[PDB]
Amino acid sequence: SKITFPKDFIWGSATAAYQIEGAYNEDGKGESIWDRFSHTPGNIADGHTGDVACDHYHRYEEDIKIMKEIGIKSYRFSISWPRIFPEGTGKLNQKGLDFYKRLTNLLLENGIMPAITLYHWDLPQKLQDKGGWKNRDTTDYFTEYSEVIFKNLGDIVPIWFTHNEPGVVSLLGHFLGIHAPGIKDLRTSLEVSHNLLLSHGKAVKLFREMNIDAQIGIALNLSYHYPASEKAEDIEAAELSFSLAGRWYLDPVLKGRYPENALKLYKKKGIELSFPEDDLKLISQPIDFIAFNNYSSEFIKYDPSSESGFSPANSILEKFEKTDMGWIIYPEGLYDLLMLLDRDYGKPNIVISENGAAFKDEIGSNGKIEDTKRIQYLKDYLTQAHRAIQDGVNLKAYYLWSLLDNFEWAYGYNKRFGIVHVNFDTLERKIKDSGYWYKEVIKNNGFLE
Amino acid sequence: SKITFPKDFIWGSATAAYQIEGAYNEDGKGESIWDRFSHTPGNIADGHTGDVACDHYHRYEEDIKIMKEIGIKSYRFSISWPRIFPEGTGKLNQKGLDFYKRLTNLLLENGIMPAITLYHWDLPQKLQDKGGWKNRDTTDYFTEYSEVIFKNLGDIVPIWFTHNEPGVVSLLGHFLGIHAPGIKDLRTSLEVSHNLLLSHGKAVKLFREMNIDAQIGIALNLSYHYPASEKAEDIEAAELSFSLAGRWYLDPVLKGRYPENALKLYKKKGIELSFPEDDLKLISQPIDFIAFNNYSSEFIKYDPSSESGFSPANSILEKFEKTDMGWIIYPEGLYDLLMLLDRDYGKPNIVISENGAAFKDEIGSNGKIEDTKRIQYLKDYLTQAHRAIQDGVNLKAYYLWSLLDNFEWAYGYNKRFGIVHVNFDTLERKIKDSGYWYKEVIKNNGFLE
């Protein structure tokens, strides 16, 4: 029927600093927890690292020329804290500022709109030696680094994101220890989650003290959690999952409270931590939008066997086509989530910081990546993005993960979310057909479903 | 019978940069191969690191005050290449220069004589990413860093050392892989040995050209290798040891050649390497003294089972008292060595860069270390040091390993060579009776054995 998005609708594409930049020990960059986690056997697939990656630190001219060829209206990227403070606090590395100052000024001049994320998982490894995000002092040092970025880049950068997916940091990084910094303790994982949100609060508070003419938010990891069957135990098992997962960070930020059903689950395993009541008021600090990262959806069943009181319903999930990551494809799962954010947090302004997919790419005998599946995935999800805007959602932006094939954390370079293929041996970019598609979607401001 | 050393004789004590300094990521210091090797499980005992160590970087005032309170006339220490050049070459780091500038000036102003080692194993990790010592271009970068140190600290600082124990670096670090950078390939272990020596040559050749009013040398790991029995297979086995071990580095430096018997061992397992045979004239470059590091002596027997063609004669070695390291005590094994270097290399000027011993220390109820064994060890070895000077040897200096308790590489902090006890929780120095002994031994010159 032709879908057309709002005229003012910002199209964009996203990347992260460690994932693409490289140059892990150049121009006075301090070590990050990821440099350190990446160097140790057993952590990354095939013993990959982010030492070189896409080498975006040197080749950012070539990238921007590509970005403009496709003609994205907004490039979402991450600032490396260790390039701005190698020691987390103290001596400013002016080289690392200049790089991001330059990059932003090349974006503005090429008519592309900058969208900065202030913490995309790096954490200087020096703050990790004094406890990292467990040491509350880190939340102040985050604010110092936030301050210096705002002074320099404040006004000229419209869209800000304090943190990317604090959910995965605390869960994978501090409880399961298959992300950096590789810690494995439940109590610590909950102390960090708080200390992260607090750090978001302190940045917003400072962002209002300075009065930067720009919009700030927080990028959360969010999926819809559907019950396995419309039965009291399974509906409740799902509501507890979403609470432990995405509502644990949504409710403190937007409702100035932690979800009760989750908190009860923690104390039933003999764990309470007395969050000071003032900290939640500081976390709840009003924000100009909520941003989130979606890819799939979860199907939870009741399970006394898991100490959680629930588990995935693998019976149901083995009915969907799966991405290369093993994650189900379910486009409507996006719509229902948008509607959940609309009908639980007061019709806020919504941004999509990340949405995309990972399929096995090849360069064919024609020297081209014909990733019809990625394209299929994309347009399916974007039809449900549109559907939600039609039914009254305030979705202001869509950022495609990712612009470039990059370092996918504990999977290494074995998974490609890029719309621009990157050969990690030659560092040659080949714009995918999902790149050329996206270009036309931005131009036409839609596609004929 | 009282022994008295020459009146000019320089008494000293020795430490290394990574073993005491700490501040492993402060004031722009680049990562080293040791920082990297320490941070990986299964390398260092009890997962110990040199991240903090004795924290000499911040507490050097205190450590000089002690150095002056005890006699010592010269302090031998190591400069961290990564503090000078974080990337091994290119951008300076003036904060790293100023630290070692300031340190040396406090030594000259407290009437103590500086003795600098230029490479004590902390190769910048960036150069290890481009092949490290196996990439010949590291032997040029070594010279660049040497240049900058000579410009600033050349004429002041009388004693220099190009390398520390390049025998261990190549054997442990690049064949056995139990030292940094952890590599396990024989071929690569000999290519590095050559590249290290070559790097020594280039530094001495650059020294002079600049015309620095001071003496340069090289600190080599050196024992004596006694045959198990006075038999043709055992005498020869012992000669082939030594040749692999210490002579491999002695002969190239002082004779301009590699030991034949050894080279013949390496071609018998199908391994040659084309020495450009003019590098060897650059390595052989005359040098003002030869320095070495002795602790024990080896007793080799013939062994067709060991693909070496020899092994330790455990039958004999189990008749000596043993240090905490498991190394035999044999004082006369110093003398015979001091006669072997005196005979076979043209009565050179000799320095002892290191001697000392590791015994289990306790703080008694009197809050004092009564390390009678360390004192016993010391005086036993020094008596044979004297004996060699009486029988003609040109031994100009003795440096006690070590001033402080430190990071003993793969053994962690489990081993104490120090004459100054260091508590690696509090960082409190308690001078170790062996310390107080050594103060009197410097003041009255020798001692009554």
Side-chain angles (χ1 to χ4, degrees), chain B residues 299-331:
Chain B
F299 277 67
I300 303 92
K301 65 174 327 193
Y302 148 73
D303 190 340
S305 83
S306 164
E307 65 190 36
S308 331
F310 63 76
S311 74
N314 293 72
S315 208
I316 304 168
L317 290 133
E318 59 161 24
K319 299 187 175 182
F320 303 104
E321 298 304 279
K322 308 86 32 218
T323 310
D324 193 21
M325 289 305 183
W327 310 339
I328 63 165
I329 305 113
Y330 189 111

Side-chain angles (χ1 to χ4, degrees), chain A residues 176-445:
Chain A
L176 296 171
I178 68 177
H179 277 203
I183 285 157
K184 293 181 189 72
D185 181 56
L186 178 54
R187 293 173 176 284
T188 338
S189 109
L190 288 311
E191 284 177 40
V192 168
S193 69
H194 181 56
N195 270 10
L196 279 170
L197 286 154
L198 179 63
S199 66
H200 155 276
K202 291 191 177 184
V204 189
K205 179 173 164 47
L206 179 67
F207 193 74
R208 302 307 184 194
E209 288 180 23
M210 292 177 190
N211 190 3
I212 306 324
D213 204 24
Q215 294 179 59
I216 200 174
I218 190 169
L220 292 186
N221 111 264
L222 280 178
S223 303
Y224 201 83
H225 298 66
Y226 299 103
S229 72
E230 57 191 337
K231 159 167 48 160
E233 61 203 298
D234 285 359
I235 294 176
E236 188 177 44
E239 285 289 343
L240 180 62
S241 177
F242 188 72
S243 291
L244 294 167
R247 230 196 311 241
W248 187 265
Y249 307 85
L250 275 173
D251 288 19
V253 179
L254 300 171
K255 302 191 167 169
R257 71 178 74 178
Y258 280 61
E260 181 72 12
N261 56 339
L263 282 147
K264 287 200 169 181
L265 195 302
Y266 287 125
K267 178 38 62 196
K268 186 49 65 68
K269 271 54 106 194
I271 158 160
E272 55 152 39
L273 186 96
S274 314
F275 302 130
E277 289 193 16
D278 0 6
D279 291 2
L280 260 162
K281 303 194 166 294
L282 183 72
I283 294 167
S284 48
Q285 278 239 257
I287 298 177
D288 306 313
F289 60 82
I290 198 75
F292 77 99
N293 311 347
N294 191 22
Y295 296 110
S296 201
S297 307
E298 296 187 53
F299 277 111
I300 307 309
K301 66 169 177 69
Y302 194 75
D303 195 359
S305 74
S306 171
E307 61 167 47
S308 323
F310 62 101
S311 35
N314 299 342
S315 38
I316 301 170
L317 297 163
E318 178 44 28
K319 296 270 192 183
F320 301 103
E321 299 303 308
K322 297 107 336 218
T323 76
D324 193 34
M325 294 234 46
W327 308 338
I328 62 270
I329 304 142
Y330 190 61
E332 310 100 335
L334 183 51
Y335 178 71
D336 289 347
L337 179 60
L338 288 112
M339 286 303 200
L340 192 153
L341 285 178
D342 189 44
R343 150 264 321 182
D344 269 319
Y345 304 96
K347 303 269 286 184
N349 284 318
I350 293 62
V351 172
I352 302 181
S353 11
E354 300 177 35
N355 179 54
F359 294 101
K360 289 189 173 170
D361 300 320
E362 301 185 27
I363 290 176
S365 295
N366 66 337
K368 305 298 289 194
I369 309 88
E370 301 183 340
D371 52 350
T372 50
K373 288 258 184 78
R374 199 171 280 110
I375 311 290
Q376 201 51 59
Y377 170 95
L378 275 172
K379 66 163 103 76
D380 276 356
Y381 272 67
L382 280 155
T383 302
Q384 303 302 348
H386 179 224
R387 163 158 111 125
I389 305 170
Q390 300 295 122
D391 294 13
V393 173
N394 286 44
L395 175 51
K396 295 303 169 199
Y398 180 96
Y399 290 104
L400 193 151
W401 189 268
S402 179
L403 171 48
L404 302 169
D405 279 6
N406 53 50
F407 182 77
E408 186 60 29
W409 312 114
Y411 278 111
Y413 302 98
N414 293 257
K415 308 289 194 200
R416 295 172 184 79
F417 287 82
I419 62 184
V420 181
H421 188 285
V422 183
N423 180 335
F424 290 120
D425 300 49
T426 90
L427 296 220
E428 181 184 322
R429 280 76 184 232
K430 294 194 153 301
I431 300 169
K432 291 184 197 162
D433 293 346
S434 34
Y436 293 128
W437 182 76
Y438 198 53
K439 179 178 180 156
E440 291 294 338
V441 314
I442 295 172
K443 187 168 292 187
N444 312 353
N445 198 279

